Structures are given as C-alpha cells and as structure tokens.
Design a binder for this molecule. Sequence first.
Ligand SMILES: CSC[C@H]1O[C@@H](n2cnc3c(N)ncnc32)[C@H](O)[C@@H]1O
Ligand SMILES: CCn1c(N)nc2cccnc21
Lengths: 625, 310
Amino acid sequence: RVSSGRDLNCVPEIADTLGAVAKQGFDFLCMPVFHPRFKREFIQEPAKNRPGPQTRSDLLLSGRDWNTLIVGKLSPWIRPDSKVEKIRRNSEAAMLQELNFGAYLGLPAFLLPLNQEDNTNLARVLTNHIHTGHHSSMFWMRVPLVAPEDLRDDIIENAPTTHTEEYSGEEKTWMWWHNFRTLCDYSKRIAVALEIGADLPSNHVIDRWLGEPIKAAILPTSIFLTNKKGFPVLSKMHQRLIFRLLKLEVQFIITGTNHHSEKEFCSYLQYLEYLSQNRPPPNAYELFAKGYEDYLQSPLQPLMDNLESQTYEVFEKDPIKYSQYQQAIYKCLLDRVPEEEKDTNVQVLMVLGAGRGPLVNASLRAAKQADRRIKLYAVEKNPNAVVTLENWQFEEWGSQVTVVSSDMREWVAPEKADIIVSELLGSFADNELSPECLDGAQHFLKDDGVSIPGEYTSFLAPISSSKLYNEVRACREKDRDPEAQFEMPYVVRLHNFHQLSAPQPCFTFSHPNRDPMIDNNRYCTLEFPVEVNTVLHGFAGYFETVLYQDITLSIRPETHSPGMFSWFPILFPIKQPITVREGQTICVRFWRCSNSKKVWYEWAVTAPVCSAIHNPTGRSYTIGL
Amino acid sequence: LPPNAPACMERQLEAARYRSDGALLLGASSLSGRCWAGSLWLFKDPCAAPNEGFCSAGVQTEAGVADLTWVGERGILVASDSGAVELWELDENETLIVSKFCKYEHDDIVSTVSVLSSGTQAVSGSKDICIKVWDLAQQVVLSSYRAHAAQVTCVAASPHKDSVFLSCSEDNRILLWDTRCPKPASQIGCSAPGYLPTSLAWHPQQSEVFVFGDENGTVSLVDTKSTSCVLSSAVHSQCVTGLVFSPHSVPFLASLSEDCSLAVLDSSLSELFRSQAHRDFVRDATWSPLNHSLLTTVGWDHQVVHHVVP
Ligand SMILES: CSC[C@H]1O[C@@H](n2cnc3c(N)ncnc32)[C@H](O)[C@@H]1O
Ligand SMILES: CCn1c(N)nc2cccnc21
C-alpha cells in the first residue's frame, strides 16, 4: 500500500515523538536536527562562543533508526540568499553545519525549502556539500504547487490579489525548482517534495511536474475536508492528484496539527490507505511492466547477435501476438486457396527468423483452422535455436517442416514461397533491420507472393522527463566518448514522463518491395505543435505493423494492441535539454543511414532551437548487417 | 523550589514581564540537549531571579516558549513551539501555575502573541504564516488571517483599540489591522522596500505612531497618519529583536539585538544608555512599575540583569 511519514517542527523528546508517530502508523518522521529557534552566531563575539552542546546527542537513537526512520530539516532562520551580508554568512555556516550533521547521522534524506525565486547561494552551498565525499542520501526540495504569495487571503485593502489570467505566472514554482536543479547540475541526490494546498492550481500548473523527480508529496491537515461522521477526507480533485501520485509511487508526508480532534492522526493516514486500496487494481501489462519502469535497456540486435534461450522464452510468453499471426495467416490462406482447391493445392509457407518455432506452430494452427494444406520452411541463423527447431521437427512436426539453418539473405531456396512470415521488428519497427533481411529473401517469394507483415511504420513523440535525461546522463563509460550515452536509443517502459505532442509516423517499409532501385535510407522532418511550457529531453518511439489486411500489431499508445506485453517503447535522448514555450513547434529531423556493414539513426532538433546532429556516421551507435 | 516547581530552569531566557506590583514573569526554553521544552516562573523578589529555589511559582511546559504575555495580573498567555497558544492561570495564594487552556490551532511554531486592549482577546502569529484572533474567555479562534506570504515575526495590539494591531513578516510587509474593516489588513511602512522588519512597539501615548526594528539593526519611528517613515537610526550591528517603551511621561525606548547589546533611546531615536552586560542574545526588557529608572533584561546566556537608566 502506502509509505508515509510525519512532518513536525516540535520534538521535545525524540524517543517519545518517534514512538508516538510509529504508534500512529507512520513509516518515518521529518524533524529538525537542531532546535528550529536556536539561531547560532559563527563570526561576532560574544554569541560565537555560546557554550555547547549545539544540539541533542546522536546516541538518542540507534544507527538503524537514523538510517531508516528520520528525515532531517534545514532550520527555518537559515537564509543563504538574505540581502543582509551577515545573515548570509551565518546562514552558509549553519547550512553546512546542519547538512554535515545529517551526513554524520547517516540520514536517508534531508528537506530544504524552495520558498522564493532566488535560491542561488542555497544551490551553491548544497552543491558544495554534495561535492564533499560521495554519499547516497537524498535532498528533498520542499516546493509548493502554488507560491504562498499567490495563496494569500485577499484581505489587504491597499494590496489586492490580481485575478487577471496568468499562464506563466501560475507556473513560477516549477521555475524555482528548474533553476535550482540546473545550478546544481542535475545531481541525482536532489529531488522534489511537492507541497499541496487547499487551492489546487490550474491543471497546466500540475502538468508542469509530470516528468520531474517527485519523491514525496506533503499534505497539510488544512486541506482535508470533514465528512458527516467527522472523518478527514479530500475533494474529488485532491483525490485525482493523489491517484496520479500513487502511480508515481511517491511517499506522502502529513504536516500541521490535528484539525479532526475526536480522531487520531492515523485518520488522515487511514484515508490515504483507503484511497490506495480503493484504486483501479493493475491490468496484466501494468503488472508485467511493473519492475521495468524507467529502466533503460539496450535494444536487442538479433541479426548481429544470437539471442539467449530465455529471450525466446519471453517472446513465446506473448499469446495475443501469436493469435494475431495465426489470424493473419488463417485469412491469407482462405484468400489464396478456394474450397474447390483445398485438397489439390498445398501452399509453401516460409518462416524467416523462426527462433524456437512458435510462428511455425501458429502457421500449423492456422492451416487446420483454414482447412488448407501448407508446406513449411523454418529459416533461423541462430544455430543454438536451430537445436530447438530440429528437436521439434524430429519429435513433433515431422517432415511437413524443413528446418533451414542459414541467413535468409544467403539461403538458396529449393523453390519459391506463397507466403513468408517474419517477426524481425524492434520497438522502432525497422531497428532490427527487417527491411534488409526481407529484401534479401524476397527473390524466393513467388511473383504473386504475400509477406506477413506487408507493412510497418515507426512513430515519434517529443517527451519531457528530467528523470530519464538524468538516467541517460549517468550511463557514461570509460574508454568511449563522454557523450556517447546520448547518441543511442534505449528500450524503456517510459513511466515518469510527459508526452509533449501526439506521435507522428516517422519511417515506413513495404514487403514485398517492388521498387526498381530499392533504397532503405530515409530522411523525415516532423513538426510537433506544443500547447504547454516544458523542457524537451528526447523522443519516445513506437511502431505499427500490418500483418495482413486488418490484422495489426501496435505499441503506439492511441492504437496499442490490447493485453500484448511484447515491445516496450524506445527513447532517443538529446545531449542538451531544450526549453519549449506554449505555442512553439518542436521540429525534429531523423535519418536512417547505412553501409554494406551497418545501419544507424542520426537525429537533430531544428526548432525552437537546433541541437547537434546525434550519432553522426554511427559513431556512438550502429546496427550490424 | 515551591510545590509543582522544577528543581532546574531551562537555560535560554526568552521572556521577562513585570506585573503592576513589581513581580517578575519568566518564560524559558530548552533550545539544546536531550529535552527541547520550556518553563514559566513568578519572582515576587525580582533580585532573586534567575535562581529556581528563590521563586514564588514555577511550572514545566510540554514545549519551548517562543513568546509570553501577562493577561492582567494572574493570566499567562503562551506562544508554543507545539503550534498551541496556551493560557496558564495563577493560583489564589499564587504558589503554583496551572494550565487553563492549551489549543493546537497553528500548523507550526507560534512565534508571537499580544493581548488586545480589551483584555478578553489576543492575537497570535506563527511560522505557518497565519495570524489568529482569540476569545480568551471562550478558548477559541474568532478570526484566522493568511495576510502574509512568509512566517509572521511580530504581532502587537494597539494600546487602546481592541480591533487594532500591527503584524510584520519575512514577506517584508508591515500590516496595520482593524477587524472592523471587511478587508482588515492595510500594508503600511516607508517609501522604498527596505530590510525585513523584526520588531514592533506602539508609542504608549500617541496611538497613531509606532517604532519597528529591521534585520539590519536599524530602529525606525513611523506615523500611521502621514504613512511615511519619520526617523530611523542604525542602533545595532545585528537584527533588532525587541522594542520596549518605558512607563515615563516622555517615554524612553529600550532596544535589544542579537548583537547581545541593550540600547536606551530618547524620542528622537538618539542613544542615551547601552549595556554589553549580556554575552549571548538579549531576548526581552521590562521597566519596573515600582522604579521607572530600573530596566530588567534577560538573554540566552541565562543572565537576568537589572539596569539603572540615567
Ligand atoms: C524471433 S526474433 C527474430 C529471429 O530472427 C532471426 N534472424 C534475424 N535475422 C535473420 C536473418 N537475416 N536470417 C535468418 N534469421 C534471422 C534471429 O536469429 C531471431 O531468432
Ligand atoms: C519476437 C519479436 N521481437 C523482435 N524481433 N525484437 C523484439 C524485442 C522485444 C520483443 N519482441 C521482439
């Protein structure tokens, strides 16, 4: 269910407080490490020589408690950005002092406010703490959805609250976070604690946070309504936000005093538990795809590489995919042998990349469904898999199946095919070089022959995710280009992100390819109208294929094949994030390039500003031929 | 130590307030060590403070005391770290101090309380950014205002007007309130935005002038009427924490700072006296009602100092 904690700014005895909040059902406690009112002097005598102790002893909890149950809080008098020089100097010293103490205690996180626009000196001081010894602990930057200045009651006669529509102004708190994090150069240790108020802002203002590293959501007691039986509860819209935040699996923090008295603080908490246990329970995909969220993987290259036995296991574990293939072959057979010919006419069906044989079996199930006669070839270059095929053809298929252990581009067929069937497709359709493989094989398809699939089309959509940008960035490796990470696609269950525009088709391929001169290179230009303010971090890729007539496969979200878990989305990063303003168009350029040896993608953003061309010459990433 | 009185008094002396009869109210917090709590003390011999076994009454508070005020002659209204305003009642004999109400209405440290000229209402301020108006008799919040955009530093009730008080905040606003107006708050202060305001005191006679102190050690004399900044002197080398007017006909201004010094100023904000006696932060000042030349300061150095002001 839910991981949640108590925020307090009063701890008389840390023993009792912790027990109490544990008793109440909290997983952890956010509290000061020094007394919030205990302003300290570092420079001026006499205050400087204030006899210690400066705070309460580390001996008061176990190492294990400090490690797991406690989040620290910067003292609220500490103002590194004060315009008063002496306050700035003491606030630097005190911020260091307090951060160093959290680190001494081995606290797993430490809360710091972004409660105004200028946090430059705060950023500078935090970045220094981070660049003093490599540690794991997190900084939770406490940012409001809505600036307190824009939340204030309209009760100052000579200083009224402006009610003029304010698109950018209502997003100012995101800019506070954005600027702070940019100064701190996207440290993986700096994340967001999103503080939520009674007034939810516009949905555009909430949308600003879609791709951001939110670790916690702070819920004041204030924002809870009361129901008839006096229980604390939340507005339908507060509930919607909570549901959004549960999907992002953040930790919830309850702050402020009890405003529902003849109820404990577990009443707030039980409400949250109530909402999580009462969420739409996860579909099959959402459970399959669960552990894989924002996890970057190399795209498979099953041409250049021999896939492992367990790789084929998981391909085979997607029945919806093979139902579709059965059905496409089913339909194609009936179209090709009339009932009066069923028994005199036997169709040569060649599986091209047969792996351990599920396409062969589907072809078999299809023919007995169609009550038509089929001769199979099962062509596979991975000789490890050929082992599985040949044990199958001996023990089960018998001689209806000729297993061919060769490359389809090289194989000399004893005869031509009525139908070729292939599943040579990656998450970006042509990224496994299905075009080149099928081009090489097409000379042995009969002049009236069907390829299944007949067609595939790749799609791109620009995305915002500071989370994924940071994950890519952290894939630097010794003994290559320090920026190579950014010039290669990743397969990933895209999760913490914002789609900035509807996907658009990128590259399309047709089989058989009639072209007199066939050329599988490509140059596409795409314009993505963007209706928000945002930061572009890369392009989600998806694909659609026509197996046969109306039978298709898709991971394109708008047309996703339902309950098919094969093929996560692909992600083209860019080296430098690009600010985009509501109304602006993102223009991206993609090339498919090749030698005799290798095929690769190059890409450039050309609007609202230009990127570098990514992966020029295939220097960071290529697909082997 | 009387019945119900702690053997030991928390180190950080936060509040000092003479009653009419010359008896001394002390608030103190524990701002360090294992236990972060606080205490209330009555010293009918003011020369015996801060020593705990020469006290008329004393008691332990759950949490630390951020601010203090007398309510008449037996009431103590308390701004807690706990987010509670708490009303402590004196004893008949006046030998113990006993909780009358303790209300958890603020979401953060209660930083500031003031009793309104009424005597039956008070206004608290808090780090939760709100200002609340209290019926003391009924033990409830009548009003609650989110006027400000940062934590509230000071709230000071007008001497003679039970609907009027000042507030100031790190949002750099000084607010003149009047609860009779549908929009009660009016933003007041100098021409240019200057340094955050830290302390407020109404002139005890002219209830349309007050002084504020800022975080840069300047004390400033303001006229609500001309709504412009009359006089200001740079009195302190650190934030001005408290401003206290003497009981005198033409009253003297006691100025306390985190620079650990006391200044006493005339009406024109000129320097008369100054005391380095303290070697930590100076927290409060009260003038003896009995001897108007006596000025009593407390500090975090746990010194109770009696000043003779010439
Ligand atoms: C089922 S995943 C695709 C399969 O096609 C096989 N394959 C890929 N390219 C070729 C090729 N050119 N010739 C024969 N088999 C291929 C791979 O080894 C893999 O088992
Ligand atoms: C079995 C089809 N397939 C290919 N060719 N690449 C894949 C990657 C993920 C899932 N299925 C895949």
